[PDB]
Amino acid sequence: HMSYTWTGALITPCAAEESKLPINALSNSLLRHHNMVYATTSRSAGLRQKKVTFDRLQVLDDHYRDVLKEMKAKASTVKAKLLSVEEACKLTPPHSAKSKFGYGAKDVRNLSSKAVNHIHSVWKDLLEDTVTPIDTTIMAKNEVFCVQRKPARLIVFPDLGVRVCEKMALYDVVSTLPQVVMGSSYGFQYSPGQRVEFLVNTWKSKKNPMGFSYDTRCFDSTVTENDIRVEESIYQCCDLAPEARQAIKSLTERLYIGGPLTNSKGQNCGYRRCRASGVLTTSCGNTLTCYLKASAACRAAKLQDCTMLVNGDDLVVICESAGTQEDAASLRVFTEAMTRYSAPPGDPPQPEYDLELITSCSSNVSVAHDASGKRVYYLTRDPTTPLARAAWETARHTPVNSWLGNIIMYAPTLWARMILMTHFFSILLAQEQLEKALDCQIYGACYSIEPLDLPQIIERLHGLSAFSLHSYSPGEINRVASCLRKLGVPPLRVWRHRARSVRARLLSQGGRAATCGKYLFNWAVKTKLKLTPIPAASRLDLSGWFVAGYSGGDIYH
Ligand SMILES: CNC(=O)c1c(-c2ccc(F)cc2)oc2cc(N(CCO)S(C)(=O)=O)c(C3CC3)cc12
């Protein structure tokens, strides 16, 4: 019962891959220790293949089937619609990988007849054939990290035509079902501000709160055929159009449960029997499956008043404490239950008695103070990976601008405000590209965003306090400072100095540029302006934003 079988054909690249940090005239203004930053390449895919390849065994008990019955009871209340071809086509990213069959993402988005004709033929075939495995391309991801080296992650995805049909059958399902089935535990529903609020209120809801993060070793590889059938049975509880049901069963049999792996050069690389990383249902399936198993394991471990927070394969549980020694015992029982369900941990879970000491999705809760002095809670992280990618993006144009994503999702943080906003607005001012829309990612979904609209977006995801936070905590300041020394990034005082320059330059352009200077950089100056609610922030249609996650899902807004 192996996650993968392999032929020995290599996972080949699509193009030239750089492993070393590109340097330009801007590089040393951000980061001087360039040998610390690297990009993963297909060269390391061979190592990743070994890591992700193992036997899965599953022992399913009454807690499991009990939780699944409840999950299905809530699933049965969901009505989901089929998307039209044209609705699905406009959800396709502009630089989504082109079809093998003679069209690309822009053909799809323009509703070109060749594209649409092929998509109708793929759909007709899904309705007619519920057995034939669907081909997938396997590729190494190119992502940037700091040293102390990870191997390349693997992306497995079907043809463009198939991807549009997934949207047609399942987009409304994966968008509406997870909140209904999991309620407040479904993490992708929250803005970062709503998410902190939920965590703190949940932490406060307990008499003696304890919490842990539970992170599964190679989650996609732990997902069995049973797990993918159980997900399908949940989707099928929904009130669906008959073609949707058939297409969902076809996509499950032929794509989701498994299939042949082909490289970029067309060679058969092997065969998948676990989760594909680049299908529509990756995030939702993972979130459901992770919730099912973890809720069941809570019951096996008799944890009092478990609150789950689940996003994909990331899981935090906050529950009632039984004292440190017994909590420790209980976590091992939790871990014992999860492992039996084929979800063992990378690192064993540790109980925590301070909300700020729990880390999941690389992030933790911390505290600062707003204008009035009142404490505000916010999500932050070690800035190392964000900064290493900022350094890469200073010298190379990338299809996803992590700096922009990081400004949006960590806008209230010290390091995003002082370093990322300062640095990238300076570059944008110099190139006169403040109004140029840039592709970025929030919860795995693709967004095209104009840097000038950041103040609006930040106010909506965080509120006006994002522009007013101060008196950050000694622990947080310490981590950032230490990261800046390790990477060879100038100290925070240099950034305050440059921010005043950036601020004045932005004000000197007037308009939306001036708004950016006023709101984003008010922290930089001594005589603080008063920051009132932004007129335009109310106008912005933030629907699609924070209903669900779509990591690997090939979704654009
Ligand atoms: C189950 N885990 C969670 O819900 C998350 C926690 C977390 C929870 C409890 C805790 F004690 C410490 C941290 O922090 C997060 C940050 C992000 N973001 C970053 C995505 O990498 S963000 C800052 O955009 O909100 C996300 C995004 C993926 C939805 C999810 C979580």
Swiss-Prot record:
Binds 2 magnesium ion that constitute a dinuclear catalytic metal center. It is found in: Host cytoplasm; Host endoplasmic reticulum membrane. The modification Phosphoserine is found at residues 29, 42. Changing residue 282 to C: Almost complete loss of RdRp activity. Changing residue 286 to K: Complete loss of RdRp activity. Signal peptide: none annotated. Residues 209-327 form the RdRp catalytic domain. Changing residue 282 to K: Complete loss of RdRp activity. Changing residue 281 to V: Almost complete loss of RdRp activity. Changing residue 278 to D/L/R: Complete loss of RdRp activity. Changing residue 220 to G/N: Complete loss of RdRp activity. Mg(2+) 2 binds at residues 215, 313-314. Its cofactor is Mg(2+). Changing residue 215 to C/G/N: Complete loss of RdRp activity. The N-terminus is phosphorylated by host PRK2/PKN2. It catalyses: RNA(n) + a ribonucleoside 5'-triphosphate = RNA(n+1) + diphosphate. Activity is up-regulated by PRK2/PKN2-mediated phosphorylation. It is a single-pass type IV membrane protein. RNA-dependent RNA polymerase that performs primer-template recognition and RNA synthesis during viral replication. Initiates RNA transcription/replication at a flavin adenine dinucleotide (FAD), resulting in a 5'- FAD cap on viral RNAs. In this way, recognition of viral 5' RNA by host pattern recognition receptors can be bypassed, thereby evading activation of antiviral pathways. Homooligomer. Interacts with non-structural protein 5A. Interacts with host VAPB. Interacts with host PRK2/PKN2. Interacts with host HNRNPA1 and SEPT6; these interactions facilitate the viral replication. Part of the replication complex composed of NS2, NS3, NS4A, NS4B, NS5A and the RNA-directed RNA polymerase embedded in an ER-derived membranous web. This is RNA-directed RNA polymerase. It comes from Hepatitis C virus genotype 1b (isolate BK). The lineage of its organism: Viruses, Riboviria, Orthornavirae, Kitrinoviricota, Flasuviricetes. The chain holds residues 2421 to 2981 of 3010 of the full protein.
